[PDB]
Each structure stands twice: as structure tokens, then as C-alpha cells.
């Protein structure tokens, strides 16, 4: 099978620099294209760069958006693939892949915000009132992501997780759960708040006012 | 550039129907490239030289077209169909990406489940005070938020976020926060969130008091 494993995203401020990486295996890297691609609900999808293999010279292209910034190269010997990111721009934040064999193959992304806010963790606020919904305030944080499991994944069915929204430079999520109203509070519901940019990782118990 | 127009942006089908979606090149290429993506996941290749189905796409799918106008047609839909789908041409620098087509499952109308949630003991404590609004598994999209406090309608402070649509039940749901200060939040007794959905040409109401 084929790997493309990224790494080097992360949170910079706008002028700073990035550099990511990406590790290929389970095909011929040095017959391979090798493109990046970017990810914003502004923009879509978005191609970043090409660099080509050894018998096509290794020749490459940027998008405008990125020419005279971004830098992309190879290491065979290493079947790796990087994109050396500066001068980086607010606009530029997005989920960046690496992607193999002209579009053939996608790694999972890498997300890379830029940003003059600073990593903050979230304040996790428990919303409690033959069903009754509970949820979870997860307020505040900065970067994205932020994982929300209920009872430590067991509650699985009866959840929403709501697309976090950045306002006033930090983001607010919310997250409901759903259990039979005889089963709370007698039997305990958990929020479990995972924060890996400020390594955050908390459980809030709901309890009844 | 060439630009790359999907259409429609946005649409729903039942399993069995057929579904054609259609990319509009601005300038003539030789080939069209199709992506399918899943929230959460990566896109994968899906249709490759205009026609050519990549591994694993099941027949129901058929690219074709040519110059500037190329279509993705599902002949009999599947559930698991639900994706975003991306058309893509190479035909030049730069690579583009049209904006995405969202194929979304058709189903019955369902009223949305209101629940409303005072500001946590713990949050007051922090001088704030966010009182939260979930209107949850309602069918189709589009909903409406009204808050009020001692009756009157509250604009400003509102905080809205929209699920996409429930890979289990195929409904959406909606989250608002209204964040106050704990002087204004102390201020006021009774708060009020009101949904107006297609399903009841009466709000749904939910409320508490301090």
C-alpha cells in the first residue's frame, strides 16, 4: 500500500516560515510527480506546487499565490517530498497534502494555521437543563483542532459536534450528547476535551445545577 | 486560470436515483479529472483523463464530456455516494479545481429537537455568561435562531454553527450561543431561543429563567 506521511504543520505567525515534509512508500518514488495541495472553506482546493522526477529534470511550478515564497524540492534517496514555506500570509492557513503520482495518491493533510493569535486552551463548560440532551461549551481555544468524545468514546450514537467559529480571535465549539433522561443524573456523562496545540486534554463531568 | 464552474453547487438524491453533475471549463481542455471527499478525509482521485474510472469506483459512475464541458453521472445513486465531488484540469499551470458539487441524501422532513442551557455555575464565575441553544436532527437545512431576553429580541453577540448533514440519520442540526457579560446576564430573568423550520408554522420555544 501507499503512504504519504506529512509532517511540519503547525501554528506560525504571518512573516514567519514553515517547512513541511512528506515521507513516501509503496511505490517507485523517482518515477513520481509529486504535487502539493491546499484546503480552505474559503478558496476549496487549491494547487500549491509540482516538482517532477529525475528524467523530466525535476522541473517545477508554483501558483502565483505562492511564487517567490514557497519552495518545494526532493530527495530520492529518502523517496521525500518538502515545501519550505515563507513569508507566510493569514491567507495561506489551510490543510496542506501531500499528494503523489499526478493526484493518484493523498496524504491525510496537514493542517498549518498562520495567525498573530497565540495557542490558548479551551474553557470547557458543561450545558446541563425520556431523553434529555446534554452538551459541552468548549470555549475559547486557539488553534484548531479540537477533538470532543462523550464517556470516553462510549457514547457514540445521540452526539453533535458543531464546527468550531472563530470570533475575537479565538474559537468556540459546542458539542450535545443524547441519553435516556433515567439514565442522568444517576449515571455519569462525560465530555472529554482533547487540545493537542496547548496539550489540553480534559474531562467534564455534567452536572445537574 | 483556467476557472472550472460546478454545477449545482449543492443538491440531494434518493439511492436509485440518477444524478448527473456538470463542470464548465472557461477556456476549451483536453481532459477533465474527478476527486470524491468525505468530511473529514482526504480526496481521492475518482475519475482520471475524463472517463477513466480510478480503482475502486464502482460502475454506477461515468465521466465523459469534451472542449469545455465535461458531467459525473451516477446512474442509480447510493447512499454512500454522499461526498463532495471536485472537477480538476491539467491542462495548463496552474492546476485548478472547480468548487465542488455536494451530493447530500434526500429524506423525510423531521422538526428540529430544541434544547436550551443556562450559563454554567463555573462559567459565571469567569465573568461570562453563554446561554445555548441546540436545535438538533431537523430535516431539510435550513432553520432560523431567535433569541430573546425578558421577550424582547436580542441581535448581536450571537455565536451559529451548522452540522453538516448526519451520516446516520441524514438530518442537520444547529448550535447558538448567545455570550453576554455576568452583570448583563444577572440583569435579565428569562431567556428565550426560538426555531422557525418549514415543518410548523408556529416557533419552536424554549426557555428558562434565572
Known amino acids: 500500500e501507499v503512504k504519504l506521511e506529512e509532517s511540519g504543520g503547525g501554528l506560525v505567525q504571518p512573516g514567519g516560515s514553515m517547512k513541511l515534509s512528506c515521507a513516501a512508500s509503496?511505490?517507485?518514488?523517482?518515477?513520481?510527480?509529486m504535487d502539493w495541495v491546499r484546503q480552505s472553506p474559503e478558496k476549496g482546493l487549491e494547487w500549491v506546487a509540482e516538482?517532477?522526477?529525475?528524467?523530466?529534470?525535476?522541473?517545477?511550478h508554483y501558483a502565483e499565490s505562492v511564487k517567490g515564497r514557497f519552495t518545494v524540492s526532493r530527495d530520492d534517496s529518502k523517496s521525500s517530498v518538502y515545501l519550505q514555506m515563507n513569508s507566510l500570509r493569514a491567507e495561506d492557513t489551510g490543510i496542506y497534502y501531500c499528494?503523489?503520482?499526478?493526484?493518484?495518491?493523498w496524504g491525510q493533510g496537514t493542517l498549518v494555521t498562520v495567525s498573530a493569535a497565540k495557542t490558548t486552551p479551551p474553557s470547557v463548560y458543561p450545558l446541563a437543563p425520556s431523553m434529555v440532551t446534554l452538551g459541552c461549551l468548549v470555549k475559547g481555544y486557539f488553534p484548531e483542532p479540537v477533538t470532543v468524545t462523550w464517556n470516553s468514546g462510549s457514547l457514540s450514537s445521540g452526539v453533535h459536534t458543531f464546527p468550531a467559529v472563530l470570533q475575537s480571535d479565538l474559537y468556540t465549539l459546542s458539542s450535545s450528547v443524547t441519553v435516556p433522561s433515567s439514565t442522568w443524573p444517576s449515571e455519569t456523562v462525560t465530555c472529554n476535551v482533547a487540545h493537542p496545540a496547548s496539550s489540553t486534554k480534559v474531562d467534564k463531568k455534567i452536572v445537574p445545577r | 486560470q483556467v476557472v472550472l464552474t460546478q454545477s449545482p453547487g449543492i443538491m440531494s438524491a434518493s439511492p436509485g436515483e440518477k444524478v448527473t453533475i456538470t463542470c464548465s471549463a472557461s477556456?476549451?481542455?483536453?481532459?477533465m479529472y474527478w476527486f470524491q471527499q468525505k468530511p473529514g478525509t482526504s480526496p481521492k482521485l475518482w475519475i482520471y483523463?475524463?472517463?477513466n474510472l480510478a480503482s475502486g469506483v464502482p460502475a454506477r459512475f461515468r465521466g465523459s464530456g469534451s472542449g469545455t464541458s465535461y458531467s459525473l453521472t451516477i446512474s442509480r445513486m447510493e447512499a454512500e455516494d454522499a461526498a463532495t465531488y471536485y472537477c480538476?484540469?491539467?491542462?495548463?499551470?496552474?492546476?485548478?479545481f472547480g468548487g465542488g458539487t455536494k451530493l447530500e441524501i434526500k429524506r423525510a422532513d423531521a422538526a428540529p429537537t430544541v434544547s436550551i442551557f443556562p450559563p454554567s455555575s463555573e462559567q459565571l464565575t469567569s465573568g461570562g455568561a453563554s446561554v445555548v441553544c441546540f436545535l438538533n436532527n431537523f430535516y431539510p437545512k435550513d432553520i432560523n435562531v431567535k433569541w430573546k431576553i425578558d421577550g424582547s429580541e436580542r441581535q448581536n453577540g450571537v455565536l451559529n454553527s451548522w452540522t453538516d448533514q448526519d451520516s446516520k440519520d441524514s438530518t442537520y442540526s444547529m448550535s447558538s450561543t448567545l455570550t453576554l457579560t455576568k452583570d448583563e446576564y444577572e440583569r435579565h430573568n428569562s431567556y428565550t431561543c426560538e426555531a422557525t423550520h418549514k415543518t410548523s408554522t408556529s416557533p419552536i420555544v424554549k426557555s428558562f429563567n434565572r
Open positions: 499528494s503523489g503520482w499526478s493526484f493518484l495518491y
Open positions: 509503496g511505490f517507485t518514488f523517482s518515477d513520481a510527480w
Open positions: 516538482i517532477r522526477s529525475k528524467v523530466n529534470n525535476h522541473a517545477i
Open positions: 477556456s476549451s481542455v483536453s481532459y
Open positions: 483523463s475524463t472517463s
Open positions: 480538476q484540469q491539467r491542462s495548463g499551470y496552474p492546476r485548478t
